Inverse folding.
């Protein structure tokens, strides 16, 4: 079962809902008219439509079409996007961007020629997201304690939204946070960030962050989160097992420069190949990706080290296909990639240090 | 100062967020493949896109382009909309529809050739919506008491949505309920409906409703509100007037059976043209229109009966442009239009009986 895939090749429809400040509708349109060109020239943009609500003049929609998820995902979290859309900050109060894959189309009163005949991804109401950031050389142990010992927020956001799990990891000065949320991601994260237990930990970390932010200014906050976002590009669920040990691991891949998007595509293909013909202790696998940052979050039955290739997603030809995309000798792993002892040592070095795994209903 | 206008003739982009039941995605796609034609064969329907979320398999998008607002409103509010989408409640847990008028388009890497050069509507993050329904002849006075003395609900829904004003009115056996909401109308109405105070009054209404409602069935209720819906097709804000008296009135226009769409577009042009060369005691006017039911909700500085033409939106030639459109005979209004004595007596006859006007802390 693959429930999330950003590699199916489907065309992408993005719904960006904007909330304009009371009375600044003329300034918003003026500011869009100045930045439209830059947005349209983004590699992968096909079409756009700026619309105002017939029910509320503060409600605006920017719907866009992209060739595939990859061009959009590369620009949405880009610093070029942030600089392109910064003169809307005077006139825009909030934004909500939903992203979808096109399955069916009707044009000319008739299904469109080229309409996909793809099948729906089956699944439950869960959204997965990852955050990654760096802390100052010399602050690693302090940051690890802070995040391992925070007061968990109330998972209850609403009838619609609930936090289901938050898993934190560390490798060197890099922290990765992954969450499972029922319902809307933005609503959940905003409820979580307003809780005293979490806002305290955030105020204690700011002094350690390699990039400095002011949770005070929504603009320094949005830029950190745009720069920290690690979208889930693949989720595959596997048949359950009857083992007495269960373990969640985070695997940070030593990627060569420019190879991150390609490692993520290899890892996604491998994970979907395992789902079609299951073999191994993996119970679920999520690929999180931002540039040359590739993380695989794996739930495993039994000892992960009894089955390195299947946990690493480098079963069969993957290990060979990954040698070209990975710098294993930068983390000290020499040896032919398919060999059993090489994959066992790669699992040990790329496994992130678990900090806290908090499960909520 | 016109904040809502459904008659600017712009085309409509509709986003319909669907939340599918967990695991029922294949059945949902198959349910849609067996209803897609009907949607295409709607007049005014131009294009459509069915999309599944990259972040959640149970989140889906139906986005469509419509010729203008009129054909869309005619359809979403219709009974055959509800019947066309009937066999999907088995795989759909919830929907949320948002309607926008398109203002700028980019096709190619180019600003679209036929893109609107229209300027934006200016306003203050308020949604306005009305509902109309009728009670069985003999239940009018019993209904008025209930609707006037019910217990108001928490105007607070969440930190982004709040109920601002609820105003109820009766005329004959017709009730009109208008609301002003900050933020999201669907969330606001669902919060209010779930409140104890208003469920109690709603249960004690159903023995009087000419129309059958079983809010016990989520469908029978959706039916009722779809049928009762009276959308705000126009809203204008006028400069504030010093004034020690401020009054809110609902004008229920007597329309010639044939058509009242044109009466709404007339009261709308006149409201928008008074919104530009404001000269009278009106501070704001919202036009509500379902079919031949036309209601103007007016905020007046001072005595409404001292400037009845401007309160009726029949200043200048409107009253004569409306003569053909109105049945002032059936209400007891004989006279020359464009004339005070008749306009004054029309205001007195079409003005609905105010039952309650609950202004919220917001």
């Amino acid at each position: 079962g693959v429930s999330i895939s950003a590699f199916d090749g489907s065309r992408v429809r993005v719904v960006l809902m904007l909330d304009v400040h009371d009375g600044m509708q003329q300034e918003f349109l003026d500011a869009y008219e100045r930045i439209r060109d830059r947005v349209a020239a983004v590699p992968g943009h096909v079409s756009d439509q700026l619309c105002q609500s017939l029910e509320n003049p503060t409600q605006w929609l920017l719907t866009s079409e992209w060739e595939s998820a990859a061009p959009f995902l590369a620009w949405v979290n880009s610093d070029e996007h942030l600089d392109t859309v910064e003169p809307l900050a005077t006139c825009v109060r909030d934004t909500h961007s939903l992203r979808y894959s096109v399955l069916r189309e009707t044009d000319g009163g008739r299904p469109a020629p080229g309409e996909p005949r793809s099948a729906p991804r089956i699944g439950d109401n869960v959204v997965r997201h990852a955050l990654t950031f760096t802390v100052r050389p010399g602050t690693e142990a302090e940051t690890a304690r802070l995040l391992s010992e925070y007061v968990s927020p109330d998972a209850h956001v609403d009838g619609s939204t609930r936090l289901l799990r938050t898993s934190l990891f560390m490798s060197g000065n890099r922290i990765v946070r992954a969450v499972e949320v029922r319902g809307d991601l933005q609503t959940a994260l905003r409820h979580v960030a307003r809780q005293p237990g979490v806002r305290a930990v955030e105020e204690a970390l700011n002094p350690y962050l390699e990039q400095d932010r002011d949770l005070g200014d929504p603009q320094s906050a949005r830029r950190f989160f745009t720069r920290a976002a690690m979208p889930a590009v693949h989720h595959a669920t596997y048949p359950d097992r009857s083992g007495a040990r269960r373990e969640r691991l985070a695997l940070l891949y030593p990627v060569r420069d420019g190879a991150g998007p390609d490692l993520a595509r290899l890892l996604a293909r491998q994970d979907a190949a395992a789902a079609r013909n299951p073999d191994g202790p993996v119970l679920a696998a999520t690929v999180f990706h931002r540039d040359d940052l590739v993380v695989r979050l794996v739930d495993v039955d039994g000892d992960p080290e009894d089955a390195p290739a299947e946990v690493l997603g480098l079963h069969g030809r993957g290990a060979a296909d990954a040698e070209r995309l990975l710098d294993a000798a930068a983390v000290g792993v020499d040896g032919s990639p398919a060999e059993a002892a090489t994959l066992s040592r790669l699992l040990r070095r790329i496994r992130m240090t678990p900090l806290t795994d908090r499960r909520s209903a």
The radius of gyration of chain A is 21 Å.
